């Protein structure tokens, strides 16, 4: 089953049919006019952010043993992990780039739907997710609502309800208890047999689209192209 797509639903419709019951949806016609949609290119990103230091995750998946985190400039990240035939997967993941670079904040907008939350606009966390084709964020859940906005490229996204948590075999450790032990796209069904029958939603999220990921919904994300997404974590 595919995540439903709705064009600019009213605040009330979003609240009653999606936010309150905790059901995912893709919102169209909302972020398609961010300036970012037309302005953000590798060249623009280099011009505005190239000299700044960013954290970069190196390795296929953050659950891997060889996975690590390092620091480099945005120019270095683009050169080593996007443009030149990269040797390893690098991902500028989960970074508050817009607090670091306020000029880029002018190219985005917080969706009006976030004002249905009980939290302060000031406390919404805005993260950049910028990387090559093939980045993977393993199946995990977050403690706030999320609007994940796709700017450049496409992502394949799989969503499992919190009701299905048993079939997802969360890690026992404290660092990883919000992360599944299962590789979604190649699950070990001898070790994790309950995963096979667990229902899910999926989508390909394209530029200009917003995915609403309800609080605690399990999500898995693979970039299909050079990709730039912006998430808003809110309550
Ligand atoms: O985009 C990705 O790779 C992963 N995104 C998230 O987990 C998020 O926005 O919370
Ligand atoms: Mn997440």
Contact 184, 139 (CB under 8 A): yes
Pocket test for ligand 1, best of 221, 222, 230 (most atoms within 8 A of CB): 221
Q: Which atom of ligand 1 is nearest to the CA of 222?
A: 3
Identify the residue whose C-alpha is closest to ligand 1 atom 7.
137
φ/ψ bin of 147: left (φ > 0), alpha (ψ from -120 to 50), beta (otherwise)? beta
Contact 229, 150 (CB under 8 A): yes
Lookup: tokens for 82? 């996007």
In angstroms, rounded to a whole number, what is the distance separating the alpha carbons of residues 95 and 194?
A: 34
Contact 78, 152 (CB under 8 A): no
For ligand 1, say whether the CB of 145 is within 6 Å of any of its atoms. no
In angstroms, rounded to a whole number, what is the distance separating the alpha carbons of residues 54 and 72?
A: 6
In angstroms, rounded to a whole number, what is the distance separating the alpha carbons of residues 145 and 45?
A: 27
Q: Residue 178: nearest ligand to its CA?
A: 2
Which fold, 1-235?
Jelly Rolls (2.60.120)
Distance in Å, CA 221 to ligand 1 centroid = 7
Distance in Å, CA 42 to ligand 2 centroid = 24
Residues 6+ apart with CB under 8 A from 96: 125, 126, 127, 128
Contact 154, 224 (CB under 8 A): yes
Tell me the resolution in Å: 1.1
Lookup: tokens for 197? 């029958």
**Which H helix or E strand runs over 107?**
none
In angstroms, rounded to a whole number, what is the distance separating the alpha carbons of residues 90 and 109?
A: 27
Cα dihedral 96→98→100→101 (10° resolution): 150
Residues 6+ apart with CB under 8 A from 7: 28, 29
Pocket test for ligand 1, best of 146, 147, 157 (most atoms within 8 A of CB): 146
> Taking every pair of C-alpha atoms in the chain, what is the biggest distance, in angstroms?
50
Which approach determined this entry? X-ray
In angstroms, rounded to a whole number, what is the distance separating the alpha carbons of residues 172 and 9?
A: 39
For ligand 1, say whether the CB of 146 is within 6 Å of any of its atoms. yes
Query: Measuring CA to CA, which residue among 95, 128, 136 is closest to residue 223?
Result: 136
209 burial (CB, 10 Å; 0-12 / 13-18 / 19+) is buried
Q: How far apart are the two ends of the chain, measured CA to CA in Å? A: 27
In angstroms, rounded to a whole number, what is the distance separating the alpha carbons of residues 38 and 142?
A: 30
Residues 6+ apart with CB under 8 A from 146: 211, 212, 213, 215, 231, 232, 233, 234
Distance in Å, CA 147 to ligand 1 centroid = 10
């Amino acid at each position: 089953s595919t995540v439903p797509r709705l064009h600019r639903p009213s605040l009330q419709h979003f609240r009653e049919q999606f936010l309150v019951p905790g059901r995912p949806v893709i919102l169209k016609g909302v972020a398609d006019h961010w300036p970012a949609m037309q302005k953000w290119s590798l060249e623009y990103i280099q011009e505005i952010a190239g000299a700044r230091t960013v954290p970069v995750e190196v390795g296929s998946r953050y659950t891997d043993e060889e996975w690590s985190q390092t620091l480099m400039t945005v120019n270095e990240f683009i050169s080593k992990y996007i443009v030149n035939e990269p040797r390893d997967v690098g991902y500028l993941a989960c970074h508050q780039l817009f607090d670091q670079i306020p000029e880029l904040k002018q190219d985005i907008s917080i969706p009006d739907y976030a004002s249905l939350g009980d939290g302060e606009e000031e406390e919404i966390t805005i993260n950049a997710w910028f990387g090559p084709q093939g980045t993977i964020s393993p199946l995990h859940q977050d403690p706030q609502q999320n609007f994940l906005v796709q700017v450049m490229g496409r992502k394949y996204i799989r969503l499992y309800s919190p009701q299905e948590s048993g079939a997802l075999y969360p890690h026992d450790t404290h660092l990883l208890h919000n992360t599944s032990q299962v590789d979604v796209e190649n699950p070990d069904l001898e070790k994790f047999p309950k995963f096979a029958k667990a229902p899910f939603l999926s989508a390909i999220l394209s530029p200009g689209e917003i995915l609403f990921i309800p609080v605690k919904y399990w999500h898995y994300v693979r970039a299909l192209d050079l990709s730039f997404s912006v998430s808003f974590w809110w309550s």
